[PDB]
Design a binder for this molecule. Sequence first.
Ligand SMILES: [Fe+3]
Ligand SMILES: [Fe+3]
Ligand SMILES: [Fe+3]
Ligand SMILES: [Fe+3]
Ligand SMILES: [Zn+2]
Ligand SMILES: [Zn+2]
Lengths: 118, 118, 494, 493, 83, 318, 328
Amino acid sequence: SVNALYDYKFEPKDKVENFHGMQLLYVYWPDHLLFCAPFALLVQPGMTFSALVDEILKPATAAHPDSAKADFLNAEWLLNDEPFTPKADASLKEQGIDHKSMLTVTTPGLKGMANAGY
Amino acid sequence: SVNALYDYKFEPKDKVENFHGMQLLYVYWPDHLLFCAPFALLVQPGMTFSALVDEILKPATAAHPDSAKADFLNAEWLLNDEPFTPKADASLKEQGIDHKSMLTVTTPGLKGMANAGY
Amino acid sequence: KKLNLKDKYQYLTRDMAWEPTYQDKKDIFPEEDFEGIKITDWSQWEDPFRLTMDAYWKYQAEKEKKLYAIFDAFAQNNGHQNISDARYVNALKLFISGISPLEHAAFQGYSKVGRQFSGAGARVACQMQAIDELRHSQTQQHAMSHYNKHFNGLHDGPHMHDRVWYLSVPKSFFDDARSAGPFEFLTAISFSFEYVLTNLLFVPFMSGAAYNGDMATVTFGFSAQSDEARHMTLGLEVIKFILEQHEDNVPIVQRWIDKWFWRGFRLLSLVSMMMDYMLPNKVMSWSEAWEVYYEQNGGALFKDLERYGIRPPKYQDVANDAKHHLSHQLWTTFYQYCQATNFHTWIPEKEEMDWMSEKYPDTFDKYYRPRYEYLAKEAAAGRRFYNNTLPQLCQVCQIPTIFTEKDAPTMLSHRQIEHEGERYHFCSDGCCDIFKHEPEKYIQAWLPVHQIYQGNCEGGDLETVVQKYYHINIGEDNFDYVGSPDQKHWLSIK
Amino acid sequence: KKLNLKDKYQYLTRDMAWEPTYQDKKDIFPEEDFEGIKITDWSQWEDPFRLTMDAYWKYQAEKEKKLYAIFDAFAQNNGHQNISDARYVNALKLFISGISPLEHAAFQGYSKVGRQFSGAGARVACQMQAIDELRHSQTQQHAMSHYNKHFNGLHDGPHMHDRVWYLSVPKSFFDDARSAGPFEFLTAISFSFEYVLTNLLFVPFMSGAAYNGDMATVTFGFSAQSDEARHMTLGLEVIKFILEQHEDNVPIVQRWIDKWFWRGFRLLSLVSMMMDYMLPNKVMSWSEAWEVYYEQNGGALFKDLERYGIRPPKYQDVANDAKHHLSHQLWTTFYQYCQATNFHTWIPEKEEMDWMSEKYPDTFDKYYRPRYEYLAKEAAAGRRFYNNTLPQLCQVCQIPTIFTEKDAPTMLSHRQIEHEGERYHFCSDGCCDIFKHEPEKYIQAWLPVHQIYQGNCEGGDLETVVQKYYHINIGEDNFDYVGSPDQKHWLSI
Amino acid sequence: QLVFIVFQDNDDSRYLAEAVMEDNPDAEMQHQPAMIRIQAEKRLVINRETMEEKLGRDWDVQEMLINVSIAGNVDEDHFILEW
Amino acid sequence: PIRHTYGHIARRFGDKPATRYQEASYDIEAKTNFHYRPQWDSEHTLNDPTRTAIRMEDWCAVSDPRQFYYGAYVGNRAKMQESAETSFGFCEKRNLLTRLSEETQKQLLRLLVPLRHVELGANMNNAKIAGDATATTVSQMHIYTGMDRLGIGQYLSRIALMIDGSTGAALDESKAYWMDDEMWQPMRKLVEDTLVVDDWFELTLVQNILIDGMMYPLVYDKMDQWFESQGAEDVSMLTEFMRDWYKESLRWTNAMMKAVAGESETNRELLQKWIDHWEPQAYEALKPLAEASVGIDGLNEARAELSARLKKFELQSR
Amino acid sequence: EIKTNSVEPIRHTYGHIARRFGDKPATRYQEASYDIEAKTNFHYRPQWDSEHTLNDPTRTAIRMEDWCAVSDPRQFYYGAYVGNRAKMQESAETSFGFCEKRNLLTRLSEETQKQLLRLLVPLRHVELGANMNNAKIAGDATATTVSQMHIYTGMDRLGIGQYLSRIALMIDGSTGAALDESKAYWMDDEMWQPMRKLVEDTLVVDDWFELTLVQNILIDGMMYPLVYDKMDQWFESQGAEDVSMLTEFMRDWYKESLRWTNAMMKAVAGESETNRELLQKWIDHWEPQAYEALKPLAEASVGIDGLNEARAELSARLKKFELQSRGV
Ligand SMILES: [Fe+3]
Ligand SMILES: [Fe+3]
Ligand SMILES: [Fe+3]
Ligand SMILES: [Fe+3]
Ligand SMILES: [Zn+2]
Ligand SMILES: [Zn+2]
C-alpha cells in the first residue's frame, strides 16, 4: 500500500469516462512478433465482433504475410486470459469485452516466420 | 663590407684546398629543367674534357629523353659566361676549368619537352 | 589535541547545525517518518566524502576551464565531422531527450532531500550531489549544442521529454522517485541508479563516444568521473547507514531494492538497444556489459550486503536471461514505430549482424536475424515496415509490452490485474509486483498511448500529434536513417 | 598629481634603470655603436605594448591551460586520424625541422638583444618577446609530439636542422640575423620577418591546418595570435624609432630592409610549395597569399614609411612576378631530391592540378602541368624520377639555383662573381647584391652540398650521408608518398 | 590602407567581433575556418564600453589578447589599430 | 548549419546563436504531464509554480545579471576562494589571531563566529527554494547561494579554529553563546522560524533580502570597521570574501525583486504583507548583536539601506 | 573506467629524447627542454665577438661533458612556469589590494615611510641589474635546460622590481614622488654605493657562469635572507609590520629558487676539480664584495648580525658543493 503524508487516493487516469464514448481494447496475436506488442485499439462498445475483426483487426494485421490466410473469428480466442467464444453479431459490450480487456486470438497452423515467432 | 667589432676576416670555407685534390664544377644545360638547377659535380683537375662528358655529364643527364642524342662535346659552351671551346683531350685544369667554374652547354635543336624547356 | 580528518570535517559541517528550541524538530523535518524508516542515531553518520566549499570550488573550476576549452575547440574545428557515421548521432538524440532531463530532475530531487534530511552530513552530501547534477545537466546542453546545429532530433529535448511516448519511460522513472519520500528517493537513485546500475548507463554512452569519434561527449564523460565517484560512495554509504540504523529498515530497504532494480533495469533497455545497434563501432555487447557491470560487480556488492540481511534483487535471474534478447527486442520495436520518434532507425549492416551472431550465439540467428532478412526484403520492395497501430504500454515502466517469458523468447510475458473495478496490464511479474504494492500511485500514470486516444495530445491522428504536440518535424527528425536529411547532410560532408 | 597609464608604466619599467657612475655606459652596452646606428634619445622609445609581469603571467597562464587541455584531448582521442589525409603531415615534417627551430633561435636572439640595448623599455619588450619564442618553441614540440608517434620524419628535427641540405635555408637565415648586430637583428626579425612577412609564414600553415582537420596545429595558431599582435607592434615601433632617431639611420635601415625582405622572401619559397602542394584541401594559392599579404598590405605599410625617407624593398617586382612560379619550381625540386628529405613528395591529383590551372591561369599549363604528365608517365613505367646528382646552391640563401629570370620562366637567374680569387654563385641579383655588400660574412657559409663533397657529412655517397649523418631512415622517412609506410598506415583506416 | 585583427573563431570572440562590427560600421569582417578576420581602412577600434554592456560585467582590454595577428599602429588605453 | 540554437531557446531569443548562460538556464526543467502526485504533499504537484502564492506570467523574467551557469559560478568562486586562502595562510603563519588578547578572542567568538549558524540556516533555506522554484533561472541561483552560505560558515568556522590551534574548543565555546547567550536568542529564534515557512518566495524574501540585507552591512561593514578600535582589525582580511560576496549578491537579489514586484500590484501587496510581518523580526534579531558591539545606530543605518533599496521595488520598510 | 580505442604508435618520443631517456613516453618537461637548440654547423661568425661562435659552450671557462647534467627539479617548461607564477601573482594582488584599500601604508608615520623608501624600495635597482644579468646568461648558455631557467628567473626579477616599485606608489598615492625619493637614495646615499657599484660591476662580467654564480648565488644567497627574512621581522619592531604581506612573493620565490640554483651548483662543482677550482677562485673574489655591498644596509636596519647569519647560511650551501666562504 502507498505510504504518504495524507490519504493518498486518486481517480484512475484511464477511466472509461475519459475516452469520449469509446473503450480501449488490446489484441494479442501470438507468434506474430512482427508487431512487437499487443495492439491498443480505440473502439465502439456497440460495434459487433465481426465489425471489430473486419474494420479494425484485419487492417492492423495486414502487413503480416499470414493475415490473409488467417481467419480470426474462428480462430481460438481468450478474453482476459479466460477461454472465450465470440458472438459475431453481438456487440463487444453486450458480450463482456469491456474497457482495457485483452483478446488473445491464436490461429493455429499460422505460427509466423522462420520458426521464430515473427 | 661588414660592420663588426673587430677585424672581420675569415678564410673561405669552400677554397679548393678543402676538396682532397678534387674540384667543384657546375654544369648548366639550358632548356632541360627536368633537372631543377645546374649540377654540382666533384671532378678530377687532371681528367680530360672528354672523360667529363662521357663519364660524368652523360650519366648525370641520362634521365632526359634528349640526352641520348645530345652531342655534348660538340655543343655550344660557355665557361663562366664566356664562349669557350673545349679541348677534348686536354685536362680540365690546363684549359682554365678551375674550381667552382660553371660550364653552360647549349644543345642546338634539343630544347626540352612540351615547349616548356623541360 | 588537534582534530582528526573526520572530526575536523564534522566541525566544518555537522557542528554548524543545532537542536532547535523555538520550533519542533518534526516541523523543521516533516518527511522522515511516513515511509516507515527509523533512524536511531544520526551522529553515527559517516561522511561519503569530505570536500569543504573552498576545495569543491577549486577543483570544479579547474575541471570546467579544461572542459569548455575543449568544447570550444571541438565546435571551432567542426569536430562533429570526425565521428564514425551520422547514424551514431541517434544515440545523442536519445541521450539529450531521455537522459539529460534526468540529470536536471536529479538536481531538483537532491536539492529537496538536501533540505529534508535531519542529519546535517546527509544534507551537505545531498546538496553537493544536487549542484553536480546541475553541472551535468548544463554541460550536456553545451556538449550537445554544436551537434544540435548540424543534425536533427536534438532541438526540443525537454519539450519532448514531457510528451513523446517512449520518453515517458525515463520521465516516469524519475517522477516515481521524486514523488516518493526521501529515503526511497535515496535508495532508488543514489543506491540503485547511481551505484548499482550506473556503469550500464555511463559506460555505453561515454565509451560509445570514444569508439566513434565523438570528442565532445567523451570529454564530458571523463570530466564527470570524479563526480560520479562521489555519488557512488554516497549511494553505498547511505544504504549501509539506513540498514544499520534499525532491524525494521531492512524489509523496507529490501522491498525498495527489488523495486528500483526492476525499474532501473527496464529504463536501461533503451541503453542496450543504443549500444548494440546505434553505435556504428561497437564497444561491447549489451550482454557482456550486463554480465560484468551487473552479474559480477552486482554479485560482489550483494555478497557484501548479505551481512545486513539483504538478498539480491527479485527477478534478477529474469534480467540476467533477458540480456540475450533485450537490444533486439527494442530495436525492432523502435524500428516499426519511428514514424513517431525524434531519431532514426535502420537495418543493421551485414558485418553488424555478424558481430551480433557472435555476441548472441544462442539467440540472434535463431530469433532476430530472420527479422532483418524479412524487413530488408520488404524495404527493397518499397514497403519499409511502419506499424500504424499503437502498442499496449506497461502500467508501471510504460514500455510497450514487448518482453518475453524466460526460456520462451516467443511468448510475451504479459500480465493483467483488476484493481478497484479497473483493468491494468504489465510487461512482466516485475512490474506487476510493483503495481500491487502501490496501486494508488500507478493508476495516476500519464500513459502516452492512452492520452493520445483521450484526445489530450493535440491531434486526432498520430502524424498530427507527432508534428504539432511532439514538435518532431515529419520527414526530418522522423523515419529510417535511409533517405533522411541527416544521411544526405553526411554523404555530402564526406 | 596622479600618474597616467603611460607614465605609470615607465615608472614600473624605465625608472628602475639608472645612469651608471662606477662603470662606463659603453662597457655595459658595447654593441650599440658599431653598426653605424645613432641613438639620440632612448626615452623617445614608445612602448609598443604595456604588460607588467603580473599581467603577463596571468594572461599567458590562462592561454596555456586551454592549449594543453586541447593537446591532451587531441592525443587521447587520436585526433591525428581526423586529418584530410596522411600527405598533409609532410607539412608538419617541414614545420618541425625548419620552422620550430627558428622559434628557438629567436628565443636566443631576443634574450641577447634584451641585454644589449641601453633603453630599459626596449629591453623589457625584447625580453618578453624572447620568452614568447621559448613558449612557441616548446608548445610546438608538444603540439607535434602525437604526430611524431604515428608518422615518420618528425623524429629528429633539431638534429636534422643542423645538417640536412634544404634546412640550411632556414638555419643560415637566422644565423645571419644573430651573427649581425642588435639593430640589424631587430630590423631583420621584429620588422621584416615578424611584421612584413609574418602572415606569409603563419596563415598558410594555420588556416591550412584548419582546412585539413588538424586541431592541434590550429590550436597553437589561435593561441599565438595575441603573442603575434605584440610581436608586430615591436617591429613597427622599432623601425619608426630607429628612423626618426637620426637621419643617418635612414640609408642603413633601407639596406637592411632590402637584404631582409629578399632573404625573408627566399625563406618563404618553402611555404609556397607547402600551401600549394602539401595541403590536401587548399586554402588560398601562394599567388593570392603573396598579393594580399605582400603586394597589398606591404604596399600600404612602405607607403606609410615614405615620411621617413624609406622606399619599398629592392627587387620587390621580381618577387611579385615569381609568385606565379615559386611553388611549382620548389615542388619539382623537392620531388626529384626527396631520396634526401625527411618528408615525401608525390604527383598532385587531377583535381589539385585543375585547381592550380585555375589559380595559375598564365603559367601552370604552359610550364608545370607537362612536368606532372611526364613524371607520371615515368612513374607508371617503373622509372619514378630521382635526380642522383646534387645541385648548385645559392651562396646567400643556400636554396638550389632553381629560380628563373623575371619574364623568362625558362632561363635560370644564375649569377656569379669572383671575390679574392674565388668563385661564388647566386640564384638571383637580390642574393648577389647581399653578397657584394658583405662578402666577408657569406664566404664562411656551410653549404651542405659542398660539405658533403669536402667529405664532412660522414659519408662517401649520398645514401650514407642521409642515413648516418641526417638520421633520415631510408625507406621510411624519404621517397615518394606512394609506397611509403605513412601511406600504408593511413590506408589501413 | 587596411588595418586588421584576426580572432579565435571562438565563443568569447563572437562577442569581441560584434563589438568591432558595432563600433566600426565601415569594417569588413571575413571568415576562414577556425578564424575571424576583420579588415578596415586606416583604423579599427574596440572600446571597453561596447564590450562592457554586452557581457554584463566589467571587462578589461588586456583580456582581449587571449583571442586576438594584428595590423597597424597600436593604441591602447581603448584598443585601436591605426595608420 | 541547419539551426543556430535549440528550439526553446530560439522561441525565446530568436533563431540566432545563443549564450552559454541561455542554453544552460531556460526551459531545461520538466514542466508538465507528471505521472504521480507527491506522497509528501497533498496540495501541489511535482514542479508546481503554485508552491509560492507569488504569480508570474513567465518565471524567466527573473534572470541572473551575473550570467551564472555552473562553469561561470565555480570559476568565479575558485578565484574568490584562492584570495581567502592567501589571507588565512598569512594570518595563521604570522600568528595574527593567536597573538590577540583572550578578551579580543572572546569578542570574535561571541559576536562573529556564531553567524556560521545563521549561514547554516540560510543554506537549508536556499536548498528548499532550489527544490521548490520551478524555473532554472531562479532555482539555480538558489543552489549557488546555498552552497555559498555553507562556504561562508566554513570560513567563520575557520576563524575559531585558527584561535584554538585546530582543536574545536573555540567552536564548542562560540556555539554555547549561540545556544545559551540571551544576546543570540532572538536571532536563533528567527532562524528556526524561517525553517518552517512553506512559501518559497516568502522564504527567499526573508532569508536573502530582509535578514541578509541588514546583517551583511551591520557585520561585514559596520561591525568590521568597529573591530579596529577593538584591537581586532587583522580579522578583516579573513572576511573580505563575505564583503565581495554580499556586493555581488545585490546584483541578482535586486533583479529578482525588481521583476517579481514589477509584475503585478497583487505581488507587490503579497510582498508588503510579508515584509511587515518579517523585517521588524529581522531588525530585532540583530539589535542585541549591534548594541553588544558597534551600537544601535549601526543597525539603524542598515535598516536605512534596506528600506531605501526596498523602495526601488515600490515597497516599504521603516 | 571509460573504455577508449588505443592505437599502436611507431615510436614513443623524439629521437633525441629517446637517445637520452629510452624509447618510452617522455614528460612535457623533457620534450620541451632537451637538445632542442642548434648545436653545430653555424654559418657565420658573430660580428660582435671575435672569440666564440654562435651557441658556444666556451663563452664560460667552466667545462661540462653534458650541460644537460643541469636540470630543473621544478620541471619548468614554459606553461608550468607561467601557471605557477599566475598563482603567485594572484596572491600578491590580493595583498596589494587589501593594503591599498585599508590604507595600511599611507597611515604610517612619515619616518616609517622613509625607512621603506630608504631600506627596501631601492632593491628594485638590484632586481633590474639581476634582470639584466639573467637575460645575458639566457643568451650565452647553450643548453635549453640552463638558458630557460635564466630567462624565467630574469623575468621574475622584473616582476619583483615591479612589486617593490608598487610599494612606493602605494605610499605616494600613485604619483611617483616616493619612487623619485627612493632613487635619490640609491644614486646619492653612501649606504647604497658599495651595492650600486657591485651591481654595475656585475654588468661587465663576460663569463656567464661567473655571472650566474655572483648574481644568483653570492648576492642573492645573502640578500634575500637578510632583507626578506631578517629585516622583515625587524620591521615589525618599527611599526611597518604591514609591509610583510607585500613581500610574501619574494619569500616564496626565494625558497623555490634555492631548488634550481643549488641543483645547478651541485652538478657544476661535482663535475670536476677544475670546475671547483674556478668556482672557488670566483667566490674568493666576489663573495666578500657581496658581503660588503649588504653591510651598510644591515647596519642601518637589523644589525651586522643579520648579515653575519645570512653569510653563514650562504657558507652552508657552498659546503654542500665542496666549496668555502667566510661564514660559521
Ligand atoms: Fe549526473
Ligand atoms: Fe551522478
Ligand atoms: Fe614565434
Ligand atoms: Fe612572433
Ligand atoms: Zn513494465
Ligand atoms: Zn639566393
